[PDB]
Design a protein around this ligand. Sequence first.
Ligand SMILES: NC(=[NH2+])c1ccc2nc(C(O)(O)c3nc4ccc(C(N)=[NH2+])cc4[nH]3)[nH]c2c1
Ligand SMILES: [Ca+2]
Ligand SMILES: [Mg+2]
Ligand SMILES: [Zn+2]
Ligand SMILES: [Zn+2]
Ligand SMILES: [Zn+2]
Length: 223
Amino acid sequence: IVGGYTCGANTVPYQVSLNSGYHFCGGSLINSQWVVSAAHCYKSGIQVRLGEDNINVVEGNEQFISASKSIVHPSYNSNTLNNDIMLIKLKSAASLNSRVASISLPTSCASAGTQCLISGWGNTKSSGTSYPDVLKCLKAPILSDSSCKSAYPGQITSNMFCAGYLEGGKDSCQGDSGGPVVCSGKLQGIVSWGSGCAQKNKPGVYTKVCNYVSWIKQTIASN
Ligand SMILES: NC(=[NH2+])c1ccc2nc(C(O)(O)c3nc4ccc(C(N)=[NH2+])cc4[nH]3)[nH]c2c1
Ligand SMILES: [Ca+2]
Ligand SMILES: [Mg+2]
Ligand SMILES: [Zn+2]
Ligand SMILES: [Zn+2]
Ligand SMILES: [Zn+2]
């Protein structure tokens, strides 16, 4: 997250860190047994870590659980990143508490203008590499589809939305990938892609979760 702030330990209790020997992507807990992340974060051998704040120190509120299965969206296109969402089932159900909680899926989509909270342990430098150990947060509004499409002509589909600042300076970045974009209490987006990070007129692009609620509900009930 570039231009964000330190969230504070466990202030984003539905945030997960996907680890395959090191943190490589974020995710969101939707119920005690399932996590939603991005399909471009797909790997074999994933351990999900809940209750994290400093991912390099065992501070006492973590739960490390292995995934039993991953389901990448059936229509995910790795070239365009369209339908960039994946579901991960945990081997054991997580114990939910104040520090580990699930986020709700949306009943409708959110309007341009709505402020959201984006978080993750991704890169914090636009030009450079600096990876934080504690969770970083960023509040950004959803941008109109028109400014999103002008920034990325022919690359935006109806399953994506941009959020951010056109002036640059604040954005999610690699490492934040798969993470949550929560607006008004609902998980509205998944950190998906962008052109570098925090560049002027290059906002972040997020998977539009409201278009996948029936697929998610059906998939988890049948697995
Ligand atoms: N080595 C790894 N463990 C790793 C993990 C995730 C990655 N994801 C990318 C990316 O290159 O695919 C990537 N994910 C992005 C998310 C947001 C923005 C943005 N808002 N500017 C840009 C991004 N670039 N490379 C990655 C490398
Ligand atoms: Ca920790
Ligand atoms: Mg994240
Ligand atoms: Zn990138
Ligand atoms: Zn990359
Ligand atoms: Zn990524």
